[PDB]
């Protein structure tokens, strides 16, 4: 199958540089055009620039002229996207994508997207604290002070899915700070178990917190 | 640098109707024009190539028209599955370059916030701090105002408010309301009061913890 | 003497089609390789092909397959070049050159280059204006204002004064083009002697000589 | 296809010295590079081909070096009518392709704009419309600010400017300022001046007409 793999997130202080990598499966890696997109947080679609790896023809975006550079690893079928000299304007998602047409259907794949932030400041782990209180009972989930983003929440492993809401991350006090809420049948919580699965993978964390009644 | 401007920013329809939305180009483009969606925290996907033709696994429920400069993105049978920001592309010129994105919206009738507290947790109080955590889930119209009451007393610092999109199932809206004391704090106070003011109710929803 | 004879501009609607001519004269017209280059207006050069007339073999570019279309009139000693569904994209110059290696020296020979604008609007010729002043040494000038499409040669006293001479680029404003030209001069010159400027727009068959009347 | 970067997007430099241009290859391509001069408004120059052999007529002062991937253009005894754009090119594989192309820029002590001011001509009038022209010629460095004012307010709307590249001769700047109003409009009013503001200026550069 294909697959365009990308880390979550990178932390780099202003000034500093920092390197995306792209890691491509499951198709013939010098075949495709190997694309590029920027998107600020709330912001629009911005075109860096794409890579062909069969020889590393390039076309660039003007705006990211001398800031982005594409290069492509072919031992490995990685692609590559260094940033240099970071300002906080550069603190965005970065996307790589393909486009395949196969004589038949025309499909596009997209790698998860890195979050590279620009900032001074360290990481820090999120606190994941339980949020425990008729037909339907609701449970919830702190995830409290963590930097930088982002972070990931399920509920069960991703069993427990209908019924969650999952609020976006406000900075706060140089912090982010997230919450979720799951609705379940009474018959469920306190009886079976609901567990909280928090993933930060900007400091390697990944907790299981779960919804005891107490 | 070719320009695509898109006239709305938000399009409005009912479950089941029918959306459009335009995007105007500074130049020719011909027919080398791209549709994309994007629900909130995922990567983009492709709807349209050539304008008008469609990537593998999109419904024909999306149909792209438009030659030149106009080019128009028509969604039939509207879901709140659909509920997304749509974006215009160019792949005529180089700089490839993008719209300003048009975020759907669907209309539904009004619904009240279901309300939930949580006192901060025995974890948490460890750590010197205490959060209290009110969530008001699955109300329309987006519009909602919380307030925070210690005692009576109206809080409006130390509070952190998140509202999510549009919910892709009731298309509701929800939001996460978090006032953080210290401990010290927390437990110099007894009564800790959640007040929403909704459009639902001329009298606000109430849900309050007495720590005594 | 070995010449390239191109068209000074074309002026050519959205979507239809334009055959940009080079002339070559003096010279074995089968004998060398036929080149052609487009320059976008501030960008740089790229290659679109070559066709060799003596049996019109091509070397096409990829980017160019479907859009230019190399051809050679052999009973006239011009060679053409075909752009269909013409683009904003395909507003540019477009050079014919050829070179020369004839056993001692190797020589260039480029055409003057065809500007073709793919737009809308009409043509329009332009009005030239006259700056005379109300010391050693006076600035007299020239208002070359409301013509298109590009481009207008400007000179003066039929190119016998060039040195002094500052002629500015054109800017767009509402579909037309506006450039000024000024040239300074002893006292001993102006008035006493006539100074002219001679404005070419050769999209209109336009050819005005304005003198600078005090 | 093969990509020739040119790293530098300007070279600066004085008269008399000598510069150097880089241009890397992604490929291996031997010595089929040629490197061009395009001049403002001209057709591009051949300069150098087979990486180091100059095209007849090119002076000895243009040189080329580099085999393989990394190549060189030396331009010694550098003139202010070496001003251009330098573009190399490779021709080992197909399709050919050309370097994104370096200025010449050339330092300079700086100097003071001459300033000039004409009112509307009388030809112009009688097509309803009026343009006030300002000349700003040979002044260094490029920056340079231009206010239009109407009987002493400062106007904004229907101005356009425009700056020529480096003289050819003195390697200075120049730029012309025209506002355009109607006919009417321009006879609305009486005082008309474009001030000038540079690095030179201890005090703004005023020329003015009174209608
Ligand atoms: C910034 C993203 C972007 O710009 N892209 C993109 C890249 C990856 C994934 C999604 C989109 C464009 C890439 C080029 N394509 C050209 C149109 N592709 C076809 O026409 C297929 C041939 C059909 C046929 O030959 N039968 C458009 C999208
Ligand atoms: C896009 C332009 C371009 O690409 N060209 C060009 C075309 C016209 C004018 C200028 C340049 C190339 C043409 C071919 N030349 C080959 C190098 N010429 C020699 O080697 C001489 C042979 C001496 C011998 O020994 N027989 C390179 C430039």
């Known amino acids: 199958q294909v697959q365009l793999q990308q880390p979550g997130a990178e932390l780099v202080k202003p000034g500093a540089s920092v390197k995306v990598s792209c890691?491509?499966?499951?198709?013939?890696?010098?075949?495709?055009?190997?694309?590029?997109v920027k998107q600020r947080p709330g912001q629009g679609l911005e075109w860096?620039?794409?890579?062909?790896?069969?020889?590393?023809?390039?076309?660039?975006?003007q705006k990211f002229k001398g800031k982005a550079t594409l290069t492509v690893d072919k031992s490995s079928s990685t692609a590559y996207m260094q940033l240099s000299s970071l300002t906080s304007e550069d603190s965005a998602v970065?996307?790589?994508?393909?486009?395949?047409?196969?004589?038949?259907?025309?499909?596009?794949?997209?790698?998860?997207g890195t979050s590279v932030t620009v900032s001074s400041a360290k990481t820090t782990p999120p606190s994941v604290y339980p949020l425990a209180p008729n037909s339907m009972v609701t449970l919830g989930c702190l995830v409290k002070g963590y930097f930088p983003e982002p972070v990931t929440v399920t509920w069960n492993s991703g069993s427990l899915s209908s019924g969650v809401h999952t609020f976006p991350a406000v900075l706060q006090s140089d912090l982010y700070t997230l919450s979720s809420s799951v609705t379940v049948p009474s018959s469920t919580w306190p009886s079976q178990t609901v567990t909280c699965n928090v993933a930060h993978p900007a400091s390697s964390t990944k907790v299981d917190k779960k919804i005891v009644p107490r | 640098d070719i320009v695509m401007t898109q006239s709305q920013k938000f399009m409005s329809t009912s479950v089941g109707d029918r959306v459009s939305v335009t995007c105007?180009?500074?130049?020719?483009?011909?027919?080398?024009?791209?549709?994309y969606q994007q629900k909130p925290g995922q990567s983009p996907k492709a709807?349209?190539?050539?304008?008008?033709?469609?990537?593998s696994g999109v419904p024909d429920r999306f149909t792209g028209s438009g030659s030149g400069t106009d080019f128009t993105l028509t969604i039939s049978n509207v879901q709140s599955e659909d509920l997304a920001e749509?974006?215009?592309?160019?792949?005529?010129?180089?700089?490839?370059?993008?719209?300003?994105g048009t975020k759907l919206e669907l209309k539904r009738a009004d619904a009240a916030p279901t309300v939930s507290i949580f006192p901060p947790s025995s974890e948490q109080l460890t750590s010197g701090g205490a959060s209290v955590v009110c969530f008001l889930n699955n109300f329309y119209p987006k519009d909602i105002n919380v307030k925070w009451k210690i005692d009576g007393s109206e809080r409006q610092n130390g509070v952190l408010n998140s509202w999510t999109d549009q919910d892709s199932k009731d298309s509701t809206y929800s939001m996460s309301s978090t006032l953080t004391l210290t401990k010290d704090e927390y437990e110099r106070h007894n009564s800790y009061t959640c007040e929403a003011t909704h459009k639902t109710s001329t009298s606000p929803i109430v849900k309050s913890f007495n720590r005594n | 003497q070995v010449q390239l004879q191109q068209p000074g501009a074309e002026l050519v609607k959205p979507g239809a089609s334009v055959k940009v001519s080079c002339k070559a004269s003096?010279?074995?017209?089968?004998?060398?390789?036929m080149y052609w280059v487009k320059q976008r207006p501030g960008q740089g050069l790229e290659w679109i092909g070559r066709?060799?007339?003596?049996?019109?073999?091509?070397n096409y570019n990829q980017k160019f397959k479907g859009k230019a279309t190399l051809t050679v009139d052999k009973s006239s000693s011009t060679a053409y070049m075909q752009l269909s569904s013409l683009t904003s994209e395909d507003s540019a110059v477009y050079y014919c050159?050829?070179?020369?290696?004839?056993?001692?020296?190797?020589?260039?020979?480029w055409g003057q280059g065809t500007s073709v604008t793919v737009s809308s609007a009409k043509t329009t010729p332009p009005s030239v204006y006259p700056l005379a002043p109300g010391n050693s040494m006076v600035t007299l000038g020239c208002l070359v204002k409301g013509y298109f499409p590009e481009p207008v040669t400007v000179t003066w006293n039929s190119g016998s004064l060039s040195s002094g001479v500052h002629t500015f680029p054109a800017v767009l404003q509402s579909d037309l083009y506006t450039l000024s030209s000024s040239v300074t001069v002893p006292s001993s010159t102006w008035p006493s002697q006539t100074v002219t400027c001679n404005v070419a727009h050769p999209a209109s068959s336009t050819k005005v000589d304005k003198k600078i009347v005090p | 296809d093969i990509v020739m970067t040119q790293s530098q997007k300007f070279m600066s430099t004085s008269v008399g010295d000598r510069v150097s241009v880089t241009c890397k290859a992604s490929?291996?391509?031997?010595?089929?590079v040629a490197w061009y001069q395009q001049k403002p408004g001209q057709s591009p120059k051949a300069l150098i081909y087979?990486?180091?052999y100059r095209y007849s007529g090119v002076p000895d002062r243009f040189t080329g070096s580099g085999s393989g991937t990394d190549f060189t253009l030396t331009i010694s005894n550098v003139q202010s009518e070496d001003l251009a754009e330098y573009f190399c090119?490779?021709?080992?594989?197909?399709?050919?392709?050309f370097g994104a192309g370096t200025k010449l820029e050339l330092k300079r002590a700086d100097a003071a704009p001459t300033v000039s001011i004409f009112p509307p001509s009388s030809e112009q009038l009688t097509s309803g419309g009026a343009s006030v022209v300002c000349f700003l010629n040979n002044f260094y460095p490029k920056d340079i600010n231009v206010k239009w004012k109407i009987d002493g307010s400062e106007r904004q709307n229907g101005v356009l400017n425009s700056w020529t590249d480096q003289d050819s001769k003195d390697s200075t700047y120049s730029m012309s300022s025209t506002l355009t109003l109607t006919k009417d409009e321009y006879e609305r009013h009486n005082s008309y001046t474009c001030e000038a503001t540079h690095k030179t200026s201890t005090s703004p550069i005023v020329k003015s007409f009174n209608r």
């Open positions: 087979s990486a180091s």
């Open positions: 490929q291996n391509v031997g010595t089929n």
């Open positions: 050159a050829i070179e020369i290696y004839d056993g001692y020296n190797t020589m260039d020979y």
């Open positions: 090119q490779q021709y080992n594989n197909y399709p050919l392709t």
């Open positions: 003096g010279y074995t017209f089968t004998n060398y390789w």
């Open positions: 066709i060799h007339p003596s049996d019109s073999d091509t």
